[PDB]
Subunit: 105 residues, 2 copies
């Protein structure tokens, strides 16, 4: 007869358990993207970011969660009309620490 397999969120939401962590989002520079102040972002640091991905990054030593743009130029763009983009020029340092894979609201 049937056997009830209990729910396992780690198997459901995490591909790389050893390179995945959660970051709490802040502010609302990313609301239009579904992220809001307080949510938990599930971050995978074992995958390489891509144009379009939402990433936890450090620009000039300060952390942020932004959308990665690699073309036409490397930038960190918000998802809230009120905010303005951040271009990563040569005098600027960009550090990508992982790709946000899920947002837990």
């Amino acid at each position: 007869d049937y056997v009830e397999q209990r729910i396992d969120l780690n198997q459901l939401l995490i591909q790389h358990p050893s390179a995945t962590y959660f970051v709490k989002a802040s502010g609302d520079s990313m609301i239009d993207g579904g992220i809001s102040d307080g949510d938990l972002l599930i971050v995978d640091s074992a995958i390489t970011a891509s144009h379009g991905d939402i990433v936890i990054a450090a620009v000039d030593g300060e952390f942020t969660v932004k959308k990665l743009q690699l073309r036409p130029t490397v930038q960190l763009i918000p998802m809230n009309s009120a905010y303005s983009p951040i271009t990563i020029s040569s005098e600027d340092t960009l550090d990508v620490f992982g790709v946000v894979i899920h947002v837990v609201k």
Copy 2:
């Protein structure tokens, strides 16, 4: 004759170039420890933190630079009398992202 061997900060300050990054400190929860709002902290993510090390960590998804205490209990303690400690209980999650190896003031 003699040839001047140009200064190289990376060789001088960085042991693991590929696992080292810089974070800018915030607030003054760590002034008595030499860190002040604005400084660059050179972080080595290739060495495992130890009791006493100052680290970049996330407690319940929020990042911080604190001093790691593994004994008598696991905590994140400031270095400013005005601030109070943070214990890492079972209902809390602690994530250590690297040991601060140097503080660069300006």
